[PDB]
């Protein structure tokens, strides 16, 4: 009966790793014995190990690159002694408080599903290291039907982090039918795959309310005025806000709007601010604050106009 | 010339740490002679009652240091000291490859506590801390070194299984306004490197806020209650306190919902909802703003009525 245990290479004094990692497997009644290494089950090249036997005492040292040792791969020392096999396994010591992965999947904006009638979903992944830029996420539909082609793009953030965003177009009829889409993320650094699913909102739906205002003339802003808009009491939280001036839509970067938050009773609420110019109101003293919502009536659109004088 | 190399115990098939971590120091390939083996924890000597040695002859020698899980994971440094007629190899707990790390925040006194109540306080906050690392100290110091008063310290268990330590420091009324900078020092044994953060009064332009109050029209089904809104914009800098007053007295924060300052192309929105008996007593509500650039007494307000 043999005995098997593994010893690994110690980290640097500052907790850092060596360039390589060496794993020594120590193996009883003498006879027939041989040692085998397994990488997550698969067998490895025997040229990677160097065995030694002293009469008995038998050992084998396997050198790994830091890339694969830190990839959380499991390595098994398979020893067949004079008959049957005996196995010991080892993986990299788990971090104390790791960060893990963070993924988000968003619902289509109502302006795309109802007003433009071409909705799109998105699989967003936030806050990861540069080497995890090759993390390829794969789409899949729960119904089994094949998915269309999606878009991928990586982005370098302020805080020195990366963000890989993947937008997926969907069919209008398919989304409202109650379909569930899933985003599957893979990378060699993560031994298991991360998945997240999103679907249409089902539940109580309430209609939004719009209140527009125009601020009085302040002494220190002769050529500028601020316009506000308050939307409230709508369910659920999916909504999209737009401002209109002279029968055209102002860009989203033109108005500073907030995210929805629940009211003290029933519904959510959103504030919006718009800074227009003196030439903006002299051409047409009319500004519309429209919103697209599921329970909005009649054509999922509701708006009101306001003038500065 | 001896060679010193250290091996350690391998973790469990699922990455778990065993009950005891074992640091095996291998000194091999030296000319046979007198040799001494000593273990050192963070520079100081460890007693030999936790070590066993084995010598054979070139010449090679091995000593096995037996530590507990609390020891090896204490982020300390261990060195195998071989005195051969001094050679040494060091090792510490293998650090995280992607560590979450600690975050700390140090905010500034509210203009209400600085001007109206005249009792300004700053607050140092550490979030996302484990159960242990829960005695992490937060000590105060100034840029000039002048004395500071006593500081409070409170801890609150959060929903996500984390802990948040809070420390509030009161400041002198005149001292904070001239331009002193206060420091918060965060240290805990598990935490390897000291964390440092400071704050001071904002050094920028000063512009008074523009206050505008309005009332939402009577929405169908909404007669027993009414929604009030207040818009405050174009004030510098982002330090501001928004309050609501009814019957010449102030209302709690829970009654209203106020946004965070966002940069203007700063502006804030607040939303207070009243009941039918609220405007029947006094049909007047004061949206009070406390800003450093306001006048006469750092306060500008406007009223609003339901009818």
């Amino acid at each position: 009966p043999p005995t098997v245990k593994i010893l690994q290479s110690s980290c640097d004094g500052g907790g850092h790793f060596p360039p390589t990692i060496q794993l020594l497997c120590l193996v009883y009644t003498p006879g027939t014995i041989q040692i085998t290494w397994l990488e997550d089950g698969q067998v490895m090249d025997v040229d990677l190990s160097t065995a030694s036997t002293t009469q008995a005492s038998t050992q084998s040292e396997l050198t790994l690159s830091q890339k694969h040792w830190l990839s959380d791969r499991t390595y098994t020392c398979q020893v067949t002694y004079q008959g049957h096999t005996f196995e010991d396994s080892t993986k990299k010591c788990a971090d104390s408080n790791p960060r893990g992965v963070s993924a988000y999947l968003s619902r289509p904006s109502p302006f795309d599903l109802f007003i433009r009638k071409s909705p799109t979903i998105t699989c967003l992944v936030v806050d990861l290291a540069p080497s995890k830029g090759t993390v390829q996420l794969t789409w899949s539909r729960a119904s089994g039907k094949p998915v269309n082609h999606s878009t991928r793009k990586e982005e370098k953030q302020r805080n020195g982090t990366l963000t890989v965003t993947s937008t997926l177009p969907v069919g209008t009829r398919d989304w409202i039918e109650g379909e569930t889409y899933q985003c599957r993320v893979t990378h060699p650094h993560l031994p298991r795959a991360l998945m997240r699913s999103t679907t249409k909102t089902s539940g109580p739906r309430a209609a939004p309310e719009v209140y527009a205002f125009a601020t009085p003339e302040w002494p220190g802003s002769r050529d500028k005025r601020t316009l506000a808009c308050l939307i409230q009491n709508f369910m659920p939280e999916d909504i999209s806000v737009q401002w209109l001036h002279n029968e055209v839509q102002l860009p989203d970067a033109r108005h500073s709007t907030t995210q929805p938050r629940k009211t003290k009773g029933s519904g959510f609420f959103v504030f919006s601010r718009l800074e227009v110019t003196r030439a903006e109101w002299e051409q047409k003293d009319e500004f519309i604050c429209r919103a697209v919502h599921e329970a909005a009536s009649p054509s999922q659109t509701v708006q009101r106009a306001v003038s500065v004088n | 010339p001896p060679t010193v190399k250290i091996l350690q115990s391998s973790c469990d098939g699922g990455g778990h740490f065993p009950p005891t971590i074992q640091l095996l120091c291998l000194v091999s390939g030296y000319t046979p002679g007198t040799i001494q083996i000593t273990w050192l924890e963070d520079g100081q000597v460890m007693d030999v009652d936790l070590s066993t040695a084995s010598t054979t002859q070139l010449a090679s020698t091995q000593s096995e240091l037996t530590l507990s899980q609390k020891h090896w994971l204490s982020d300390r440094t261990y060195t195998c000291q071989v005195t051969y007629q001094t050679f040494e190899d060091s090792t510490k707990k293998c650090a995280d490859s992607n560590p979450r790390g600690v975050s700390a925040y140090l905010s500034r006194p509210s203009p209400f506590d600085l001007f109206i109540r005249k009792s300004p306080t700053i607050t140092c906050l550490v979030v996302d801390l484990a159960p242990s690392k829960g005695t992490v100290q937060l000590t105060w110091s100034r840029a000039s070194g002048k004395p500071v008063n006593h500081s409070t310290r409170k801890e609150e268990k959060q929903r996500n299984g984390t802990l948040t330590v809070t420390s509030t420091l009161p400041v002198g009324t005149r001292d904070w306004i001239e331009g002193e900078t206060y420091q918060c020092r965060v240290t805990h044994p598990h935490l390897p490197r000291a964390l440092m953060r400071s704050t001071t009064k904002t050094s920028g332009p000063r512009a008074a806020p523009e206050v505008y109050a309005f009332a939402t029209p009577e929405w169908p089904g909404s007669r027993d209650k009414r929604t009030l809104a207040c818009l405050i914009q174009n004030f510098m800098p982002e330090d501001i306190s928004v309050q609501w007053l009814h019957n010449e007295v102030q209302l709690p924060d829970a009654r209203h919902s106020t946004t965070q300052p966002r940069k203007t192309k700063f502006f804030v929105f607040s939303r207070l909802e009243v009941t039918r008996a609220e405007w029947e007593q006094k049909d007047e509500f004061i949206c009070r703003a406390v800003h450093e650039a306001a006048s006469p007494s750092q306060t500008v307000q406007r009223a609003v009525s339901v009818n």
Epitope: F17, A129, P130, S131, G133, R158, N159, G160 | S198
Partner: antibody
Framework: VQLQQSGAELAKPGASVMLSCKAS????????MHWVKQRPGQDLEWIGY????????EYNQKFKDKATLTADESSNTAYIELSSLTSDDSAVYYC????????????WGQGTLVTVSA | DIVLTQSPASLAVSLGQRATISCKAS??????????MNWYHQKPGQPPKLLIY???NLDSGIPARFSGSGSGTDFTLNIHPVEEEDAATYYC?????????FGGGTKLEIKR
């Protein structure tokens, strides 16, 4: 955590040169490595960066036609190829390295002085 | 294309005195409530080294005489007391948005 660049180099006008920048050691999380041009006694001008793990790049509007960043992940090495060499290209070229979760530079190279003349 | 303009371009300070350099920006170098302003200094023949990041944070291994303050559009670097080893050219940098840009430089001279 050291960066070493190519030595001094000379080029004829209209030719091309490629400068290397190798990082010592293996960094697990990855890193962006930029390149910074410093004309003789003038401002520090930013060129662009590249993530060798994927090869994604972002250039400045001025050097979009003059510089080309390439990198190989296996050897921890990056390259910048300068085309249409002119007297304006006679300058000092540094390869700086930004680390993960950093809003700044962490390691700098020794610099590769390029002299463009005949 | 945020541009940085630091002033002055050259100054002389006595040994043990206080040195003050301003770095003005065309746009708010602040985002998400945080400041993305850094400070470097360049010795002759060597690349610059980081002195202060995020305006008000010192790098590992930097003396306590250096202190940075400010946000938004105006920034300031303070050296007190000045020593003989600070003779270099100081550059301020913003990491707020591409492209990253440096200031014109400030050459500090140690009077003696």
């Amino acid at each position: 955590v050291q960066l070493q660049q190519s030595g001094a180099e000379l080029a004829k006008p209209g030719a091309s040169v490629m400068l290397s920048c190798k990082a010592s050691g293996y960094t697990f999380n990855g890193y962006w490595m930029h390149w910074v041009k410093q004309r003789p006694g003038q401002d520090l001008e930013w060129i662009g960066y590249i993530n060798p793990t994927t090869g994604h790049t972002e250039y400045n509007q001025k050097f979009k036609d003059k510089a080309t960043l390439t990198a190989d992940e296996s050897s921890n090495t990056a390259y910048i190829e300068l085309s249409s060499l002119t007297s304006d290209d006679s300058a000092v070229y540094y390869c700086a390295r930004q680390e993960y979760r950093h809003s700044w530079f962490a390691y700098w190279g020794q610099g590769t002085l390029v002299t463009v003349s005949a | 294309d945020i541009v940085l303009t630091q002033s002055p371009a050259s100054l002389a300070v006595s040994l043990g005195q206080r040195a003050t350099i301003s770095c003005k920006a065309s746009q708010s170098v602040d985002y998400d409530g945080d400041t993305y302003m850094n400070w470097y200094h360049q010795k002759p023949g060597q690349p610059p080294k980081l002195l202060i990041y995020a305006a008000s944070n010192l790098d590992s291994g930097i003396p306590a005489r250096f202190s940075g303050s400010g946000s938004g559009t105006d920034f300031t670097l303070n050296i007190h007391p000045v020593e003989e080893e600070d003779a270099a050219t100081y550059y301020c940098q913003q990491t707020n948005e591409d492209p990253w840009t440096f200031g014109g430089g400030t050459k500090l001279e140690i009077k003696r």
